[PDB]
Amino acid sequence: TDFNQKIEQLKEFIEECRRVWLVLKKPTKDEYLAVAKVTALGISLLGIIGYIIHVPATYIKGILK
Amino acid sequence: ETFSKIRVKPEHVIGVTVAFVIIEAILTYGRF
Amino acid sequence: PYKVIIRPVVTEKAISLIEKENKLTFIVDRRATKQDIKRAVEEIFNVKVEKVNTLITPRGEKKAYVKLKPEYSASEVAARLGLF
Amino acid sequence: MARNKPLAKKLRLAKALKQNRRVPVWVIVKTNRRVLTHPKRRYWRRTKLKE
Amino acid sequence: MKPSEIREMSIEEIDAKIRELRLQLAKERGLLTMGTSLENPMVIRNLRRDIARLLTIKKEKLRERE
Amino acid sequence: KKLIPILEKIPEVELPVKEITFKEKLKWTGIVLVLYFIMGCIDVYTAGAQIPAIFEFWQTITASRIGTLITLGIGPIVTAGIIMQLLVGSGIIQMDLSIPENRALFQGCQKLLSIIMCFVEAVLFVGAGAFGILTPLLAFLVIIQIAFGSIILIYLDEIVSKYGIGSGIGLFIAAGVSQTIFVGALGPEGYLWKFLNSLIQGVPNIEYIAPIIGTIIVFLMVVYAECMRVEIPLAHGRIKGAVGKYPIKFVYVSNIPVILAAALFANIQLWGLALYRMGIPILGHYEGGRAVDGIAYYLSTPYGLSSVISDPIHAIVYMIAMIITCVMFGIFWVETTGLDPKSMAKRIGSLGMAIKGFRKSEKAIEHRLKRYIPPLTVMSSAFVGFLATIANFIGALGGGTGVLLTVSIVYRMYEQLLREKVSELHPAIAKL
């Protein structure tokens, strides 16, 4: 019984996925570069700050044992 | 948040951690 | 080559026509013929047209009620149109 | 009916329908002080109307 | 686009691209009417100008030839 | 907990009565951020330090160090939440967030669990001879340090989640992952140099370029996924066409979910390894954290470089295992905590927002969302699971999963932060 259940459902289901997948905004250059920018800038901030703080403080702290 | 009537001010929470830091930062390295 | 479809109408009314009736709603050119709509539709979206009913609205546009045959699908066509 | 509206007359009526709208906001900013709403607003009791 | 590309094309290409241009236009008008996320006159405007160019050069050729 | 007495006995952090300007939300965040990093350069006292614990699957997902004061990390909060999301989200108890009851219940329980899991995880670690210590005096001393640090983090998490920028969890993960990359790439043991120098020498790049390509694949993918949103129109501005859209976060019904999914696999590898030096293996045979065939082999997470993908079966299973466990918590995300079909209901109807072409009613718009929901929610999850998985296989820095999570959480949080960074030029105070 169940294999049939699942097969029927899968067919119904996939067709609804396809509908959604046209609504979902198509990525193109402009959009891409937009995200990429803001994104990278952010990750840079967070990233830099941890390097400058961790690494130097560890060479100090570590040799104080 | 919940229906707790017990609450504390961020300055303390902040301060408890800067404590812990100072403590082990000298208790461990050097054993001051 | 035929083409006299401006675009599909998106309305709550349109939804009932796509799901239930297997109908499409289109805005077509201002002065038209049912025959020019039947064939233009039939090529463009790639469907076989059962019928056209058309009425010219007082908005300055013509609106087309296109019936489809049931080996073809109102839903698939509409989903592509006017989306990304 | 009302008798009756030929194909072109629905077009005319439609032009007439457009005019009975207030002027939209974006125009007034674009002029930069101001454009009053200005009489081409249609009633339906009070409107008798040569052709 | 440029006027140049049209004249390099064969007559066969002008025709093929004309239909693709139209179909794409039909689709963008449907997006504007639904509502778009940000306003682009770009999509409708540019396509109408491209459609105009292709047709204009096609007819001049056709006169010349015939 | 679930009962008004016990709930009141947990002390909470109070609601803002202080300003939350751009500068102030920053100043909170930043204090936490540094204290995190700092606690990671300090090790325990037992009259020896720089004694790490052995793990090669715990470090990634907590985005923290082990052997320090924040060895457990985010671990309690995530563990707890796995359970939460399985129960209330499977609907065998009813306590879905909606009303200030069910709400203040979900919180209180999840809050509790964390203080329990701080101790538990600490004790469980030490008790299996993780640091090597297995003598009661020194054992106790460790347990203290461990669990007390995690406990502190839980309250800082509370401060970020209300006062600071964005939420608690997210900060920490992104924090850690970021550092791991910036330190690996540019630090003393930096890849940039190893890559740069080898290219100049005129010998291959195929083990110095490896991490770097890995990071690009993850980004490229995720960035794409962030352009895809589902825009629902808003009411007429008294002009033709429906101007303004309300968007939905495609990867947010698989974000918090995969964090629970990955964490799920960790506590299986852990529990199997623990009981084989503390009990008897019943789960799977783990030694070194993984095997070479079997159930053990297939349920292991090999971040950064791999070669165990050379056994077919290993790949096939893991993938499908991740995928399905993500689907689960994804559907169950819709149900409990965020994105609900029942929150978004009255919400769009109150402001009376419409879709082009009538659709001024409640039930019209209401349906189109509830309908659309399940397929998106499944799709999202499916997609994620794959991405995550192959991104660990290829090998990437911070691990596949880590880069994913970071890029996404950071960019919705950067969005929030831009909207704050601008309103602070104007006299009105930002809080957006």
Curated annotation (Swiss-Prot), chain A:
Question: Is the Transmembrane helix keyword given for this protein?
Answer: yes
Any single Gene Ontology cellular-component annotation: plasma membrane
Q: What does the record say about its membrane topology?
A: Single-pass membrane protein
Major localisation: membrane
Q: Could you tell me which SUPFAM superfamilies the record lists for this protein?
A: Preprotein translocase SecE subunit
One of the Pfam families matching this protein, by short name:
SecE
MF annotations from Gene Ontology: protein transmembrane transporter activity
Keyword annotations: Cell membrane, Membrane, Protein transport, Translocation, Transmembrane, Transmembrane helix, Transport
Question: Does the keyword Protein transport feature in the UniProt annotation?
Answer: yes
Q: Where in the cell is it found?
A: Cell membrane
One GO biological process this protein is involved in is: protein secretion
Q: What ranges are annotated Cytoplasmic (topological domains)? A: 1-34
Report TM segments.
35-60
List the InterPro entries hit by this protein, alphabetically. Answer: Prot_translocase_SecE_dom_sf (IPR023391), Translocase_Sec61-g (IPR008158), Translocase_SecE/Sec61-g (IPR001901)
Q: What protein family is recorded? A: Belongs to the SecE/SEC61-gamma family.
* Subunit details: Component of the Sec protein translocase complex. Heterotrimer consisting of alpha (SecY), beta (SecG) and gamma (SecE) subunits. The heterotrimers can form oligomers, although 1 heterotrimer is thought to be able to translocate proteins. Interacts with the ribosome. May interact with SecDF, and other proteins may be involved.
Q: What does this protein do?
A: Essential subunit of the protein translocation channel SecYEG. Clamps together the 2 halves of SecY. May contact the channel plug during translocation.
HAMAP family, alphabetically? Answer: SecE
This protein is called Protein translocase subunit SecE
Q: State the species of origin.
A: Methanocaldococcus jannaschii (strain ATCC 43067 / DSM 2661 / JAL-1 / JCM 10045 / NBRC 100440)
Q: What is the lineage of its organism?
A: Archaea, Methanobacteriati, Methanobacteriota, Methanomada group, Methanococci
From Swiss-Prot, chain B:
GO BP annotations, alphabetical order: protein transport
What is the designated name of this protein? Answer: Preprotein translocase subunit SecG
Topological domains on the Extracellular side lie at 30-32
Tell me, what does this protein do in biology? Subunit of the protein translocation channel SecYEG. The function of the beta subunit is unknown, but it may be involved in stabilization of the trimeric complex.
For this UniProt entry, what's an example GO CC term? Answer: plasma membrane
Which UniProt keywords are given for this protein, alphabetically ordered? Cell membrane, Membrane, Protein transport, Translocation, Transmembrane, Transmembrane helix, Transport
Q: Where does the protein end up?
A: Cell membrane
- What is the covered span of the full protein? 21 to 52 of 53
- Looking at the UniProt entry, the stretches that span the membrane are 11-29
Quaternary state and interactors? Component of the Sec protein translocase complex. Heterotrimer consisting of alpha (SecY), beta (SecG) and gamma (SecE) subunits. The heterotrimers can form oligomers, although 1 heterotrimer is thought to be able to translocate proteins. Interacts with the ribosome. May interact with SecDF, and other proteins may be involved.
Its membrane topology: Single-pass membrane protein
- Family designation: Belongs to the SEC61-beta family.
Q: Please give the chief subcellular localization of this protein.
A: membrane
UniProtKB/Swiss-Prot annotation, chain F:
- Which Gene Ontology CC terms are recorded? plasma membrane
Task: List the PROSITE patterns.
Answer: SECY_1 (PS00755), SECY_2 (PS00756)
Please, one GO biological process term?
Answer: SRP-dependent cotranslational protein targeting to membrane, translocation
Identify the segments that dip into the membrane without traversing it: 55-62, 63-68, 69-87
Q: Where in the cell is it found?
A: Cell membrane
- Coiled-coil stretches are none
Summary of subunit composition and partner proteins: Component of the Sec protein translocase complex. Heterotrimer consisting of alpha (SecY), beta (SecG) and gamma (SecE) subunits. The heterotrimers can form oligomers, although 1 heterotrimer is thought to be able to translocate proteins. Interacts with the ribosome. May interact with SecDF, and other proteins may be involved.
Function, as annotated, reads: The central subunit of the protein translocation channel SecYEG. Consists of two halves formed by TMs 1-5 and 6-10. These two domains form a lateral gate at the front which open onto the bilayer between TMs 2 and 7, and are clamped together by SecE at the back. The channel is closed by both a pore ring composed of hydrophobic SecY resides and a short helix (helix 2A) on the extracellular side of the membrane which forms a plug. The plug probably moves laterally to allow the channel to open. The ring and the pore may move independently.
What's this protein's name?
Answer: Protein translocase subunit SecY
Q: Which organism is it from?
A: Methanocaldococcus jannaschii (strain ATCC 43067 / DSM 2661 / JAL-1 / JCM 10045 / NBRC 100440)
Q: What is the lineage of its organism?
A: Archaea, Methanobacteriati, Methanobacteriota, Methanomada group, Methanococci
